[PDB]
Structures are given as structure tokens and as C-alpha cells.
A paper describes a structure:
Rspo (R-spondin, also roof plate-specific spondin) proteins are evolutionarily conserved from fish to humans and have well-documented roles in a broad range of developmental and physiological processes resulting from enhancement of canonical and non-canonical Wnt signalling. ZNRF3/RNF43 specifically targets these Wnt receptors for ubiquitination and turnover, hence reducing Wnt signalling responses. Direct extracellular interaction with Rspo proteins inhibits ZNRF3/RNF43 activity. Here we report a molecular level analysis of the ZNRF3/RNF43 ectodomain structure and its interactions with Rspo proteins.
Sequence analyses suggest a putative domain structure for the Rspo proteins comprising two furin-like cysteine-rich regions (Fu domains) plus a thrombospondin type 1 repeat domain3. We therefore engineered constructs to express the region spanning the two Fu domains of Rspo2 proteins from several species. By using a combination of heavy atom and molecular-replacement-based phasing strategies, we determined multiple crystal structures for Xenopus (x) Rspo2Fu1–Fu2 (highest resolution 2.2 Å), xZNRF3ecto, zebrafish (z) ZNRF3ecto and mouse (m) ZNRF3ecto, (highest resolutions 2.4, 1.6 and 2.0 Å, respectively), plus complexes comprising xZNRF3ecto–xRspo2Fu1–Fu2, mZNRF3ecto–mRspo2Fu1–Fu2, mZNRF3ecto–xRspo2Fu1–Fu2 and xRNF4F3ecto–xRspo2Fu1–Fu2 (at 2.1, 2.8, 2.4 and 2.7 Å, respectively). In the crystal structure of the isolated RspoFu1–Fu2 protein the two Fu domains arrange sequentially to form a ladder-like structure of β-hairpins. Each Fu domain comprises three β-hairpins rigidified by four disulphide bridges, similar to the cysteine-rich regions found in members of the epidermal growth factor receptor family. The connection between the Fu domains shows considerable rotational freedom, allowing a 50°–60° variation in the relative interdomain orientation. The N terminal of the two domains, Fu1, is distinguished by the extension of the second β-hairpin. This prominent loop presents a solvent exposed methionine (M68) at its tip, which we term the ‘Met-finger’.
Author numbering: 36 to 150
Write the structure that this text describes.
């Protein structure tokens, strides 16, 4: 289908939106091998919304093993089998920290080891 260019301040002929209305989130979509600017009310899964200094945008979550990003560097929810710890995703909680198996986070534990 041919994209209709919506919620937009500058609509182009062949590239969708070039500048969204202030409140909408700019999103770059691929149709028939072309890139189209779209203006979304909320970003879709795999992205996070952020207010940049130029516009609201949907940025791609690139954290390894992350399901949902809070921001570029912080994962809110990791994929299956991973624990979140300081915004990253771990198969095992690191030294000093203990797993909570119902929420899949790492929390403060002991640093003592027997000699």
C-alpha cells in the first residue's frame, strides 16, 4: 500500500513526513524499499520514545538481550533467562548481588567469602 502522510508539519511527495507536529513521535518506516517518516502517538515495541533537542522520536532499543528499553543505555525488561542489573542484561547476577527469580532483577547481597 501507498503511505498516507499524517499528523505532519512538512509532508513530502515520496518520503512521508519530514517534520511531525510537536507532540508526535517521529518514526522511520520502510515500505517498498523506501524510508518514510511517520508521526506516531506512541512508539511501537522494539523502540523507546524520547524527547530529543530537535523533536520527539522513536529510537531503536539496541541493548543486547533487552526486550524493552528505558533509554539508550538502560534496559527496563530483559529477554527470557536474563536478569536486569544497572540497566544491562545478565545470565547470572554478578558478585555482590543476588537474583530475584520472580521479577528477574539482581539486588544487593553479601561480599563475604570463607577462608
Amino acid at each position: 500500500t501507498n503511505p498516507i502522510c499524517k499528523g505532519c508539519l512538512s509532508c513530502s511527495k515520496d518520503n512521508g513526513c519530514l517534520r511531525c507536529q510537536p507532540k508526535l513521535f517521529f518514526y522511520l518506516r520502510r515500505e517498498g524499499m523506501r524510508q518514510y517518516g511517520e508521526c506516531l502517538q506512541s512508539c511501537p515495541p522494539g523502540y523507546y520514545g524520547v524527547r530529543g533537542p530537535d523533536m520527539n522520536r522513536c529510537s531503536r532499543c539496541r541493548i543486547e538481550n533487552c526486550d524493552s528499553c528505558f533509554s539508550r543505555d538502560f534496559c527496563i525488561k530483559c529477554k527470557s533467562g536474563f536478569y536486569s542489573h544497572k540497566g544491562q542484561c545478565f545470565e547470572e547476577c554478578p558478585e555482590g548481588f543476588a537474583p530475584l527469580d520472580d521479577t528477574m532483577v539482581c539486588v544487593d547481597g553479601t561480599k563475604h567469602h570463607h577462608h
